[PDB]
């Protein structure tokens, strides 16, 4: 059938790159134009791209076998031999990391708990700090299935071990650039988002991470190309791709006011025509509708044109 | 268009009553047959039932205007004036609570954080204990927009009143029965799951909560009727209802070998024909296929035939 979209407002959706609600919808021409996000990526033909999972609960998480060692130059670490989050074997393949693995940089606080398999399993929990970044550490290679972290909080002298699940808690020194996935070697990646026509800019769905700085915590924005419900929608459908892009309208739910027309490119990112210097936010209580298949060179009206 | 389901394995899905992956798929005739779950409830016509939200991130969470008051020999007491989790006004209506509010009982550990509205907002995080009730001394009223939690404190914690979001962390004394929604008074509820034909039992999607005691923590099962991906699927579609149920087959994804046939009743729960007395677990790497619309009286094949 013709491609269509759920008639769900962004403010009711789940974020696709940090596991929290969508709070914001914006364009910002001052930001990197062609981010190389690995989560929140789907093709309109139904193919999840990069490390994108179908479940929001997998976003910025990982599963592993946990053990401990002294690391040369660093000190006491935990090593994590990664597993897919459903417990299935991780095999290095056509994506940078296990499904849902973090696709940004910074020092991530993770909470690591014993795997839950049945009622009565005894659970330990330990908190760690994991450096995602331009690391050159042979122990940090999520593509090959191994990462490491430092212990930062422990309930007891009996730390978590064996099969575990890691969830994100907070970020320090956040940078929205891909981590080092394969210890400075080439790694399979979803390509950068783009290209855009002249005057076209990426539509961003925004949430907030808890960013710590020793004493005081602050909100830090993180964007994604589509909410997780739109990711799972395309993955659950097998739409026929009839052209390069879909023309959409975003309308106020209550009044029907057109807020903007936009293009959903086949590779799963939305473009608006906007040439301001700084951020333009939109109401999150609007609806998307599919108008038509259109060519890549289809010229959009500028936001607020009459 | 004919009803179809996403071709997603249970083990790749999100749980609809506790915000975690689905780990298990089972029937268990020892458990309560007709539970009154309020989350994870959707009609095949696309209507969210009970308190069920679209987003898995809303499950067992709430949002509120918080007021904190210190009480000698308790600590900080939070009065939360609930809002919907999108920041919209909560109005007592045709469901027991704001969307996604917990639908089980026990003492819930919640992590409460300052509302996040823009980069640079200063955030404070505090962990509270919330008795979901019913207890002879519980006066929770989420239906009216008013709930309470407390944190043990020798002195004031200098908490700041304002808008917050609360997420679940652990449970103590879990019981799978509805919480105190309205100060011991009646409240609109999604009806119990059912009814079932003779020999039919509920199919359960299982995850595990962290359940704490004084010095220990252990996994505790919680079941839901559908994964959150099926909830959001039905709510996103507007299928034309043609009969009373959908005949499904649960199949090995590779081989296509049938594990069982089942009925998805229009009111959003799946039945199998199973008369064992013990729990019967299923592999979580199968998929559900819609076969056809069938009436309420359609007799399923017994699991194993």
């Amino acid at each position, epitope marked *: 059938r013709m491609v269509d979209l759920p008639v769900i407002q962004p403010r009711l959706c789940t974020h696709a790159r940090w596991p929290a609600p969508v709070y914001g919808l914006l364009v910002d021409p001052s930001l990197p134009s062609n981010p190389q996000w690995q989560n929140g990526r789907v*093709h309109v*033909d*139904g*193919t*999840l791209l990069g490390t*994108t*999972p*179908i479940s929001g609960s997998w976003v910025s998480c990982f599963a592993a076998e946990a053990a401990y060692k002294f690391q040369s130059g660093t000190g006491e670490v935990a090593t994590f031999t990664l597993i*897919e989050q*459903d417990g*299935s*074997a991780y*095999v*290095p*393949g*056509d994506r940078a990391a296990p*499904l849902g693995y973090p696709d940004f940089s910074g020092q991530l606080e993770i909470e690591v708990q014993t795997e839950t398999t049945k009622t009565g399993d005894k659970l330990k929990v330990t908190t760690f700090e994991m450096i995602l970044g331009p690391t050159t550490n042979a122990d940090q290679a999520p593509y090959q299935g191994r990462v490491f972290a430092s212990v930062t909080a422990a309930a007891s002298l009996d730390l978590v071990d064996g099969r575990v699940r890691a969830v994100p808690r907070s970020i320090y020194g956040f940078q929205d650039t891909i981590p080092e996935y394969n210890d400075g*070697l*080439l790694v*399979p990646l979803a390509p950068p988002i783009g290209p855009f026509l002249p005057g076209e800019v990426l539509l961003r769905f925004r949430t907030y991470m808890r960013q710590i700085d020793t004493a005081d915590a602050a909100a830090e924005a993180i964007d994604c190309a589509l909410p997780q419900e739109f990711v799972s929608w395309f*993955a*659950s459908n*097998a739409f026929t*791709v009839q052209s390069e892009a879909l023309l959409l309208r975003y309308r106020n739910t209550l009044t029907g006011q057109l807020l903007f027309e936009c293009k959903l490119y*086949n*590779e799963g990112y939305i473009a608006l025509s906007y040439s301001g210097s700084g951020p333009l936010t939109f109401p999150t209580d609007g609806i998307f509708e599919v108008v038509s298949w259109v060519p890549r060179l289809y010229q959009l009206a500028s936001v607020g044109s009459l | 268009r004919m009803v179809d389901l*996403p*071709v*997603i*394995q249970p083990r*790749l899905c999100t749980h609809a009553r506790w915000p975690a992956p689905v780990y298990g798929l089972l029937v268990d005739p020892s458990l309560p047959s007709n539970p009154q779950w309020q989350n994870g409830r959707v009609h095949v016509d696309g209507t969210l039932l009970g308190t069920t939200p679209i987003s898995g991130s809303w499950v067992s969470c709430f949002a509120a205007e918080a007021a904190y008051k210190f009480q000698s020999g308790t600590g900080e007491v939070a009065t939360f004036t609930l809002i919907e989790q999108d920041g919209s006004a909560y109005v007592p209506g045709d469901r027991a609570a704001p969307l996604g509010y917990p639908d089980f009982s026990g003492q819930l550990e919640i992590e409460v954080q300052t509302e996040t509205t823009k980069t640079g907002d200063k955030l404070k995080v505090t962990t509270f204990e919330m008795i979901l009730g019913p207890t002879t001394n519980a006066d929770q009223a989420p239906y009216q927009g008013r709930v309470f939690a407390s944190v043990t404190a020798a002195a004031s914690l200098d908490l700041v009143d304002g808008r917050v979001r609360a997420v679940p962390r652990s449970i103590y004394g879990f019981q799978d029965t509805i919480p105190e929604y309205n100060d011991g008074l009646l409240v609109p509820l999604a009806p119990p799951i059912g009814p079932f034909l003779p020999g039919e039992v509920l199919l359960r999607f299982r995850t595990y909560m962290r359940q704490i005691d004084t010095a220990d923590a252990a996994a505790e099962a919680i079941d839901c009727a559908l994964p959150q991906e099926f909830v959001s699927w039905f709510a996103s579609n507007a299928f034309t209802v043609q009969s009373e149920a959908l005949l499904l087959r649960y*199949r*090995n*994804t*590779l*081989t*296509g070998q049938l594990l069982f046939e089942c009925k998805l009743y229009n009111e959003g729960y799946i039945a199998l024909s199973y008369s064992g007395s013990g729990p019967l677990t299923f592999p979580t*790497d199968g*998929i559900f*296929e819609v076969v056809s619309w069938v009436p309420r009286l359609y007799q399923l094949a017994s699991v194993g035939s």
Partner: nanobody
Framework: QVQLQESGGGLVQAGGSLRLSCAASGRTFSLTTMGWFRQAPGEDRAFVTSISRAAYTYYADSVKGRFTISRDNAKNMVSLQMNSLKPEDTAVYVC???????????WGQGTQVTVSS
């Protein structure tokens, strides 16, 4: 649900070439990406190559510039042209497919490739 049937394979001398193909049948709208893994005795499957519905390809470093994958969407069929075969390419080659959850869900029966010296 989705069956994968391989063709091709067998014995070749080092420096030679073989073509493998794979055809999918059953409920193929649940089959997204198709690819090839290979396995030596006592070892796990290792990724060789994949190709998406949009014909986007990935290759293991060890086979880059020697192996080429192609796909026919209408026939749910892929081909792997393997040139400049090396001893270390000796393995059982297995056609694979992802389902809608982005996991590798479907396996062929496997075909022995032996690169003799």
């Amino acid at each position: 649900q989705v069956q994968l049937q391989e063709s091709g394979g067998g014995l070749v001398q080092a420096g030679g070439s073989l073509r493998l193909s794979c055809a999918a049948s059953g409920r193929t709208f649940s089959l997204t990406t198709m690819g090839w893994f290979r396995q030596a005795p006592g070892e796990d499957r290792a990724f060789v190559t994949s190709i998406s519905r949009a014909a986007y390809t990935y290759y293991a470093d060890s086979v880059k510039g020697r192996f080429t994958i192609s796909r026919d969407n209408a026939k749910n069929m892929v081909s792997l042209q393997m040139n400049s075969l090396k001893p270390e390419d000796t393995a059982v080659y297995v056609c694979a497919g992802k389902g809608q959850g982005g996991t590798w869900d479907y396996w062929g029966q496997g075909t022995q490739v032996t690169v003799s010296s």
